[PDB]
Design a protein around this nucleic acid. Structure first.
Ligand SMILES: [Mg+2]
Ligand SMILES: [Mg+2]
Ligand SMILES: [Mg+2]
Ligand SMILES: [Mg+2]
Ligand SMILES: [Mg+2]
Ligand SMILES: [Mg+2]
Ligand SMILES: [Mg+2]
Ligand SMILES: [Mg+2]
Ligand SMILES: [Mg+2]
Lengths: 77, 149, 190, 51, 117
RNA sequence: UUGAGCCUUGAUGUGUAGGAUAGGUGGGAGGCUUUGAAGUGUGGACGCCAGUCUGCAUGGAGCCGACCUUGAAAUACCACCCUUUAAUGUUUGAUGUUCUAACGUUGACCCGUAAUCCGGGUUGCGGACAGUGUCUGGUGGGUAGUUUGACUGGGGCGGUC
RNA sequence: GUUUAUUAAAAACACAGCACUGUGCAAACACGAAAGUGGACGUAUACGGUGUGACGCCUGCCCGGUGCCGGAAGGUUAAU
């Protein structure tokens, strides 16, 4: 499901407001991209379905820290 | 990101600098093939401990792989008991493990392959000279005197 | 430099020829390029001008001793008006017009001083100092400044000559100082 | 066709071209295609060349 | 720019007009001028005079590589055919060998029909 | 590598009475060239082939000014520059060159596995394109919600408000 | 041949034939927020769309309008 494994980001509903101001139900998907991250500490690639915000979080926190969070909530990878 | 490097790294790196690189390059190439690493601050001081140690300390220790030769010119003369044929011309002859082993065996402790006797010292008798090696740039001269006893 | 290098005049005869050509803005909307009644500049300069006036046969006994030399009489208005070879400049204000002897077919003459009480009164200075500099092609400014007998002393024509920046139009940028002549060229900023 | 003249003379000397191509086969090949009409042209071109 | 000194004169000579191009020994174009482009248009440009001035404007345009001697290759019938290689001698060029290159089909295409004038 | 800004550096002007292919005002009655010139001879070259500029060079030592005219006077010298053009950069991309490592594979292979899915792995071809997210201009009866007045000798047409 | 099961069987629909137009294959097109499918285990002598309607003899003139295709110099023009 269009869901980022790092942050939880998933689609959200809002409106399209026309110029006349007509609302219309729409969605806002996240910027998901499945990506192979090299985990040195496991001599293995782990590919994640992440949002770019996700990448940014992996870059800062550190993959080993992020993978741990998933492991913590029994999220599989 | 910032990221601090590991190996030399081409048109940007150094060996342990704090450059700044496009994340596409850091993830996907550098850090994976451990040529650099996230500048997580935690790290940037992991490197400040590494900015005092090996450098400031173990180069005034090569100021000891150097001041070994402050005791190369303060004696400046070992004698070898090697005699003389038919006119004060060595009945013996002295090389490197002769001029490093007859150097070590006193208060002048050198590593046997740290004694450069040009095709010389030993060939004939009397005074000669040699090139004593402890550092790559700082060696030092002495005087050798093959004594015909 | 930051201000002006007046040591940058450093083989004619004298470098009085170092003209003040500070850029102005274009004509976006409506604007003009006007020079006041002889811009004097807070430097005496030392210029003994020749100021030809349209005065009368009365002011030839004091309207000739205040930074000038002579004055054109009442009989010499059209008694010397038949020769392109035989014939700042002045023109008294109020209800006095100059089109019956200075408007036919091509020079620069307009302001000098309008006086009915005194031809040369105690304090009325500003004439025997500098000239004017009106519109030419795509800009104006064209004048002169300082000499070879100056230094950072004739650089008062930089904080009181580039300060002659008047109201611009809209979508324009008047600011670019540039002096020197009969030797080299250049200037810094404004 | 080709003249590779040598040393002392600047005059053309190319009398060659009126002995081969040029209008010879250039006015010829130029226009209409002819056909069975050259048979009639070359017939009169021989009733001449008898005398 | 550049320098060659050993060149080739190419002249296209067709009843309607003639054009001159001077090129190097490989056939890389150096300079060109044309009877119709030197002025004169119509019956005007269809003359050997026009072709003359055309080897001229051309010489003042190819001397811009310092040419000293050049071969001549003539194509077509038409005025200016040879009147234009006279202009090239005089304008101060050495002139090596002359040639005719006007193409001669061994009877290929059917040439146009008409000309009931 | 190339389209635009912007900053220095060089060009060039056939309205008429004329010593003559006057750019506008401004300094402006001596600068200049032996820091080796005028004018011949070509070179690259702009172009209404009218002619000009110049690095090189043969060269070897003076030209000028209100001069009277012209609505405006000097190739006497210098400027901020306009007509339009040209050459390096600074910067911004954009177009164009390669790489591989992200990413694509609806090529081949290995394993899980007696499996035309899938995952992992190897290899080949691609490759920072493609594609997707957010934002944005265009397109959009395909779909949607609606509007499309009243008076009137019925309504409509005409007319009217 | 088909059709208005139940007031219309027809000249209406289809038809072989013809033409135009799209499609290089992960085809176009189509069902699908997607994955997965059909097209097709086909590959331009194939597949989709559109009009015409065996066959004979033939199918002229008009590109202003609307539609479609191509074009880029200038003009105008979004977020930024
Ligand atoms: Mg519809
Ligand atoms: Mg509708
Ligand atoms: Mg009604
Ligand atoms: Mg039937
Ligand atoms: Mg029925
Ligand atoms: Mg029923
Ligand atoms: Mg029935
Ligand atoms: Mg079909
Ligand atoms: Mg029909």
């Amino acid at each position: 499901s269009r869901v980022c494994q790092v942050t939880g980001k998933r689609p959200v509903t809002g409106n399209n407001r026309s110029h006349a101001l007509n609302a219309t139900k729409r969605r806002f998907l996240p910027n998901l991209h499945s990506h192979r991250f090299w985990v040195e500490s496991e001599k293995r690639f782990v590919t994640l379905r992440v949002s770019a915000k996700g990448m940014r979080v992996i870059d800062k926190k550190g993959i080993d820290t992020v993978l741990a969070e998933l492991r913590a909530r029994g999220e599989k990878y | 990101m910032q990221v601090i490097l590991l190996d030399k790294v081409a048109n940007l790196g150094s060996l342990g600098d704090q450059v700044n690189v496009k994340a596409g390059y850091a993830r996907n190439f550098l850090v994976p093939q451990g040529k650099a690493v996230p500048a997580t601050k935690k790290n940037i001081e992991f490197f400040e401990a590494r900015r005092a140690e090996l450098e400031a300390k173990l180069a005034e220790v090569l100021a000891a792989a150097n001041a070994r030769a402050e005791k190369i010119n303060a004696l400046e003369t070992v004698t070898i008991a090697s005699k003389a044929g038919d006119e004060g011309k060595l009945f013996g002859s002295i090389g490197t493990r002769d001029i490093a082993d007859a150097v070590t065996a006193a208060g002048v402790e050198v590593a046997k392959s740290e004694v450069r006797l040009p095709n010389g010292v030993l060939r004939t008798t009397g005074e000669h000279e040699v090139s004593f090696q402890v550092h790559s740039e700082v060696f030092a001269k002495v005087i050798v005197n093959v004594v015909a006893e | 430099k930051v201000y002006t290098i007046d040591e940058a005049a450093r083989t004619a005869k004298f470098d009085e020829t170092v003209e003040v050509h500070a850029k102005l803005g274009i004509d976006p909307r409506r604007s003009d390029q006007n020079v006041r009644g002889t811009v004097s500049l807070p430097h005496g300069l030392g210029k003994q001008v020749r100021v030809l006036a349209i005065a009368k046969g009365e002011k030839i006994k004091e309207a000739e001793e205040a930074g000038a030399d002579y004055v054109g009489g009442e009989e010499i208005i059209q008694k010397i008006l038949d020769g392109w070879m035989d014939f700042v400049m002045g023109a008294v204000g109020s209800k006095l017009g100059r089109i019956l002897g200075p408007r036919g077919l091509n020079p620069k003459a307009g302001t000098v001083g309008f006086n009915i009480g005194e031809i040369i009164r105690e304090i009325k200075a500003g004439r025997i100092e500098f000239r004017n500099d009106k519109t030419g092609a795509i800009h104006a400014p064209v004048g002169k400044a300082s000499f070879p007998p100056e230094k950072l002393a004739d650089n008062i024509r930089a904080f009181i000559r580039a300060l002659e920046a008047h109201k611009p139009e809209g979508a324009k940028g008047t600011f670019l100082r540039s002096v020197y002549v009969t030797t080299t060229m250049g200037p810094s900023v404004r | 066709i080709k003249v590779r003249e040598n040393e002392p003379f600047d005059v053309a000397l190319r009398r060659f071209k009126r002995s081969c191509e040029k209008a010879g086969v250039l006015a010829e090949v130029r226009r209409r295609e002819f056909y069975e009409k050259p048979t009639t042209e070359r017939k009169r071109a021989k009733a001449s060349a008898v005398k | 720019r550049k320098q060659v000194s050993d060149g080739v004169a190419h002249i296209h000579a067709s009843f309607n007009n003639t054009i001159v191009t001077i090129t190097d020994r490989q056939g890389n174009a150096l300079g060109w001028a044309t009877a119709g482009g030197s002025g004169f248009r119509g019956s005007r440009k269809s003359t050997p005079f026009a072709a003359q001035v055309a080897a001229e404007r051309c010489a003042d345009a190819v001397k811009e590589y310092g040419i000293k001697n050049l071969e001549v290759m003539v194509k077509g019938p038409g005025p200016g055919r040879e009147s234009t290689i006279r202009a090239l001698n005089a304008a101060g060029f050495r002139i090596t060998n002359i040639t005719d290159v006007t193409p001669i089909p061994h009877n290929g295409c059917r040439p146009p029909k008409k000309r009931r004038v």
